[PDB]
Design a protein around this ligand. Sequence first.
Ligand SMILES: *[C@H](C/C=C/C(=O)/C=N/CC(=O)O)CCCCCCCCCCN=[N+]=[N-]
Lengths: 257, 246
Amino acid sequence: ESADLRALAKHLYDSYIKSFPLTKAKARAILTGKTDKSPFVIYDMNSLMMGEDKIKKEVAIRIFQGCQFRSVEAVQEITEYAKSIPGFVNLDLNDQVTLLKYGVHEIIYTMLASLMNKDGVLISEGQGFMTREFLKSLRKPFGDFMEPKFEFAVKFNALELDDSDLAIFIAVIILSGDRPGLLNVKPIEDIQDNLLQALELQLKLNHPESSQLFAKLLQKMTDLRQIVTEHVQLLQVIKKTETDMSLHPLLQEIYKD
Amino acid sequence: ESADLRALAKHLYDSYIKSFPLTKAKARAILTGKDKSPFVIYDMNSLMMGEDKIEVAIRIFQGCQFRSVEAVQEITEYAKSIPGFVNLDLNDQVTLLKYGVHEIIYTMLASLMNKDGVLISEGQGFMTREFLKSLRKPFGDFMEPKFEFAVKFNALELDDSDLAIFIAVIILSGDRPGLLNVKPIEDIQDNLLQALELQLKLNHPESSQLFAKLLQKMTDLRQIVTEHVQLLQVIKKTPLLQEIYK
Ligand SMILES: *[C@H](C/C=C/C(=O)/C=N/CC(=O)O)CCCCCCCCCCN=[N+]=[N-]
């Protein structure tokens, strides 16, 4: 039944709204210009100094630590979301941990796109906007930790997904039977089969004119995986050049591989 | 309607058979049973003997390079049979082939692999997985991740009919760097993906979301390709021939 699939789509959307305070719908309203929602714009060193004044070491470092503490929050929301995915919680505990471990970054970059356009990114729950050019300005190695994310975001935002589509997509990502060290792959794949079935129907109903959006979206997973590996290599460099610099344990457990 | 998709699937099948001499159906027959068993290479002495029937890790690696170059031409001919491919900007054609060939070489190599080895020399031979892994560094950890991909990929149980459209979808990727006119490429790929989807529903009616799982395998291909290129760069630190194989 299509109906069982629609109900699973409605359940995941609902749960996505409960888990993630800044939706794509909100992020777009802020970026697009729908008076009360307008962000303060950080494009240079003086703007940054003024940002603390209303928005919520050394500059590139302070910014980078800012993202790290923001990724940790995101891991906490994504983890909350995951428990809502039917069956995830019944999986062997080790696997739950493995799925989260490899799923969490791909999801972060998927949702980060929602906060992005060609020339910048939303910050402090949408109160701020930091320009892409200011971020690329940052002293090396931090100059280009964000560039690949912008590049993916511009391409990904071209699909015009809305939140109800993404809720199912990030579910399909978490429930990948193809992660290293999975003890029981089979229970994971039956859940994903179901999620994929629900995505498929949801894209066809919600995006009727968008030929092969399902396929086109699944190919994006390749771009996500590429982004993750590049970030890891960049982190390796930071820990060597900035030995003073501290990484959050939660993030540091995710990177152990 | 679907009749234009079925036409497309048969066309591509017919072209894939003409372009690739050793098909998956034929490679399977040999790996499992049914009529000359291949000369098996499992040891240094089997290799030596096998050259007569058909500076070690290096000889084997240059053979992989010779065969990959043969496969490039087979794939180029196939590509030209894909509707719309020859009508694309010539530079776009070279770019699609340039970046698409490694992914397809590994896709098709999976047809020639099982978990314990790979067929060589048009199926006249069989080089065992253990003897490849056995080879000194960095040649040992070289073929090992393709076996890993091939085991997972073969579990989808695709046949030649299916892979012919899949290969076509790979070649028509609009995200290759430096493309000049992405539109007609995406337009062809959209049409190929519709053809692949219908193929998999008719040909594998009980295999839920096979289309989706197959597309998910594109991630693994690109990961492998990127890993391969990183091993090549390390080999580069170990006459006319350099030129031919580049
Ligand atoms: C930051 C998004 C980061 C993505 C990412 O993957 C980062 N990884 C870092 C890592 O792995 O270590 C872009 C938005 C800019 C953030 C600026 C927010 C300011 C908050 C300050 C809070 N201060 N503290 N602590």
